[PDB]
Symmetry: C2
Subunit: 216 residues, 2 copies
Amino acid sequence: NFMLTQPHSVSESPGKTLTISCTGSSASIASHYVQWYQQRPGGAPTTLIYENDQRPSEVPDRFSGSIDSSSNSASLTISGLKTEDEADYYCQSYDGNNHWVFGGGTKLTVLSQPKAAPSVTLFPPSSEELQANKATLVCLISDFYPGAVTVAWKADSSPVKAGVETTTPSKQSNNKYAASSYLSLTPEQWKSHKSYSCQVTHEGSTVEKTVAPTEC
Amino acid sequence: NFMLTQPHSVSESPGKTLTISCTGSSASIASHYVQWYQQRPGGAPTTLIYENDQRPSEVPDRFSGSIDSSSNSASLTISGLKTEDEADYYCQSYDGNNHWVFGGGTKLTVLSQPKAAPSVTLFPPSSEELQANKATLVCLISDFYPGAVTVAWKADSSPVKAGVETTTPSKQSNNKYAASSYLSLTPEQWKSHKSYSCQVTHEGSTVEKTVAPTEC
Ligand code: NA
């Protein structure tokens, strides 16, 4: 039935303005009231926006709500960004039976350092692995900021989904993020295809790397 | 100066008995009092044991602390593991100047599913990488539970710390955990050494793979 989708992450420098979206599925977003909550790490969530655009008195005017019926979305706009705004933000509404429905949440990053697109290194199966009748590709994703990427794999052009595992991005020692996606297959599938590809999307950046069985 | 070392992770089925050890370095464990704190996931830390073995009345008698001067260690024992005992555990004492000294912390898991040691797949630098005057080794760690590991690299037989980056464990789709570690070298250092090793520790069990520079 009805479900709410939010972006995983949003970013902006201090003093500027960003916006978090909340897109509904299977039903109109305008059918029920939409709420917005801020969740600092540990502690009670605070109500920022209720009934689409009404704001509690203790919430500053920087936070505003809106509803766009054209895109079936709710929007939380935050101006005059401060570092204290760094938190997780949730949108909430009701389904057909007036039962609660929440979004996945959005990590707000107040940019403290230069942005960085990831390095994408694709590894073919090691000879040791292939001697053990096993085959796994590893897509290493390193040195990106903020820490939100989506990975897509391809075999001989067509995309694959079965056998794909992607780890949650975690921080390296230089305050940048690292992650890795891996695709496990049988050695037959590995050789029965001309090439494999791993495609990483990081905001408006897309890198795709391609490997083929070794000829050496 | 004075340091306190705990195992990284421990686990056991409900109802059994488990001991977490805290070994001191550079000074005697019997010189100052030892505390044991418990941090449940997402909660505030509380005092389990203070002054080596004194127990606050609100703490169940299933907890107990001891001191062993022969091994220069303090130990927390939990008789009859309960589900609410799943938490992080810390030992704490003082140095010669009576400043706080904390152990590294131990993650305790009450087993809800079978324990599974990790698979460790070690990848050498690809040709596409060495073509670009770059070299990265990737250690893929997958299919383990509980989700807690520590990774250590070695060049030939000496431990290497510069260039290591390890990601945090992420829950795969089969309800087990995966993680990765990578070591970034120059193509000169890769060719110079005769072998590289990645050592993964999972609750006193260690898996360790080795690769050597072979042309292609
Ligand atoms: Na667990």
